[PDB]
Amino acid sequence: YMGWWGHMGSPPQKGIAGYTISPFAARPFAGVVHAAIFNTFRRTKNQALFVILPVSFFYYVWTQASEKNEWLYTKAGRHELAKAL
Amino acid sequence: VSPKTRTSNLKNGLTIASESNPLVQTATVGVWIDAGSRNENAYNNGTAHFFEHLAFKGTDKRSQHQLELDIENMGGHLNAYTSRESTVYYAKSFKDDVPKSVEILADILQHSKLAESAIDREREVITRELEEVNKQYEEVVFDHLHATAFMNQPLGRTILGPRENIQTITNTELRKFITENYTADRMVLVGAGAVDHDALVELAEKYFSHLPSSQSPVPLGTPIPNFVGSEVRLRDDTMPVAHIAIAVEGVSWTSEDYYTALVAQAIIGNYDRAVGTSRHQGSRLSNIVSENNLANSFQSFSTSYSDTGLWGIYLTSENTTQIDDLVHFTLKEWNRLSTSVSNLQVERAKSQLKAGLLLSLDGTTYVAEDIGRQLTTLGRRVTPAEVEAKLEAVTEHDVRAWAQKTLYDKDIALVGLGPIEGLYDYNRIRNDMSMMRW
């Protein structure tokens, strides 16, 4: 499923003209400030839910579990601990 | 030793230049103009080429049909071509048909109708030319090469111009172009073959005396180009042959390195598998390419303009899995112009060029083209003795110094057309412009 240079396995290409300029002719950091602020904000905003929802859910579960565990091993939690074991 | 080129001027500033050859019976007279597509802006790009079509579409006296007949009756032919910096209109005839041909050329240049009906008719013919150059692969490659090397500059524009302009070129802008550009101080009347100089000067006084002079007469071959390292890829898997051009910014006509760049070009040279002798050429690249079947052909070039040039190579190959090797070996031969060339290659190339520059001029049309080109680029015809001296002045140190400032580690303009999947990206090509071992 992959060939090599000259016979890579692409369907025939026709009609595409590609253009580019030399690394010495270009400013490598052109538009960096716009990218760093606006591009990163867009990319991050669009993926935020997929991180926030699972992280926040599992952090909540952990927080509840660790707080209960802590309370069961106090004096106040003696009776509830006795039942739990 | 060839006969001396005689040169005279008129009062308007039209140059007349002639080289007589009493051994031939034909003569090529014509007008070389120091003007071409580069003189257009973006809005009238295509005008110079448009005019070339209309020049043969009828004058104030002779109609289109009469024009055809008059030339047919002369016996020879007329020809014209427009380039970026130069326009030519010439007539090849019999010895004694020269006064007729000068008269017809003077007519089509000064007194052309440019009738709205003819503008409208050619506007379709030229539109069809846009879709048929597509076949002339060398021209496609060189036009993309200029377009990218001189990105958004006048030298980068095509001669035909965009489709948009072809539809909007008016007789007004045609007339304006030829009034601004076709002035006497920019024109040379040239005769080669069976011409008398004194006869040609008289014909010039008769037909080209009412030519406008420009307000500010600069010398012939008077011009800032900013070369862009860049690439155009026109991949077409259905084509069997890849066409590749690689160039760097080269030298102008009046550069002090003009001969050095020609010698360097001759060290790499040309190659064509179809020619029998090509497998035995001395050039290292030729030997590599022929032994390994890397290419069908390659042609080194050193194109000059008034203020810049392009120096490089044009390759054709069916070996689509070894394009990488072809480009690699080519650029490693260029590296050697910087690192390795000695008196051995330099003196061999000088020998070959001393003859080559003279051999090229083998007919009246070639002679006229040589007088016309030299007069419109340098302001004078350079004698073969001067040319032999300038070639002899090229040393191996000159070639190395030139290559180290022009080739070594420099940006290239690269155009690939056809099955060029194997042509690597810009960086890997440009990395072959130097050698890490040196």
Q: CA–CA separation, B87 vs B80, rounded Å?
A: 8
Q: In sequence order, which residues have a C-beta less than 8 Å from that of residue B380 and are 6 or more positions away?
A: B7, B374
Of B230, B235, B427, the CB nearest to A25: B230
Residue tagged 């060839």 (tokens): B2
Q: CA–CA separation, B124 vs B39, rounded Å?
A: 24
State the count of interchain CB pairs (< 8 A) between A and B: 66
Q: CA–CA separation, B241 vs B138, rounded Å?
A: 12
Q: CA–CA separation, A64 vs B386, rounded Å?
A: 97
Of B419, B421, B426, the CB nearest to A20: B426
Q: What residues of chain B lie within 8 A of the CB of A7, using their CB?
A: 320-321, 421
Supply the range of the domain harboring residue A81. Answer: 1-85
First CA to last CA distance, chain A: 59
Contact call for residues B220 and B376 (beta carbons, < 8 A): yes
B183 burial level (CB within 10 Å; 0-12, 13-18, 19+): buried
Distance in Å, alpha carbon of B327 to nearest chain A alpha carbon: 14
The H or E element that residue A17 is part of is: strand A17-21
Report the number of distinct structural domains present in chain A: 1
Of A10, A17, A22, the CB nearest to B234: A17
Of B230, B236, B421, the CB nearest to A10: B421
DSSP designation for A36: I
Long-range contacts formed by B127-135: CB under 8 A, 24+ apart: B127/B163, B127/B166, B127/B167, B129/B160, B130/B160, B130/B163, B130/B166, B133/B160
Q: CA–CA separation, B417 vs A13, rounded Å?
A: 12
Q: What residues of chain A lie within 8 A of the CB of B432, using their CB?
A: none
Resolution value (Å, 1 decimal): 2.3
Using the beta-carbon criterion (under 8 Å), do A5 and B321 form an inter-chain contact?
A: yes
Tokens read off for B291 = 């032994």
Report which of B231, B275, B287, B141 is spatially closest to residue B424, judged by C-alpha positions: B231
First CA to last CA distance, chain B: 45
Per annotation, catalytic residue among B19, B40, B52, B85: B52
Contact call for residues B227 and B308 (beta carbons, < 8 A): yes
Report which of B63, B59, B38, B60 is spatially closest to residue B49, judged by C-alpha positions: B38
Identity at B141, one-letter amino acid code: V
Using the beta-carbon criterion (under 8 Å), do B323 and A8 form an inter-chain contact?
A: no
Tokens read off for A42 = 């867009």
> Quick check: A2 contacting B, CB < 8 Å?
no
Q: CA–CA separation, B21 vs B25, rounded Å?
A: 9
Residue tagged 């890397």 (tokens): B294
Supply the range of the domain harboring residue B125. Answer: 6-208
- Chain B, 296 to 325: residues with Cβ < 8 Å from chain A are 320-324
Q: B191-215 b/e with 16+ CB inside 10 Å = b? A: bbbbbbbeebbebbeebbeebeeee
Q: CA–CA separation, B240 vs B385, rounded Å?
A: 46
CATH code of the domain in which B149 resides: 3.30.830.10
> Quick check: A19 contacting B, CB < 8 Å?
yes
Using the beta-carbon criterion (under 8 Å), do A7 and B231 form an inter-chain contact?
A: no
Best of A13, A16, A24 to mutate (most B CBs within 10 Å, chain B): A13
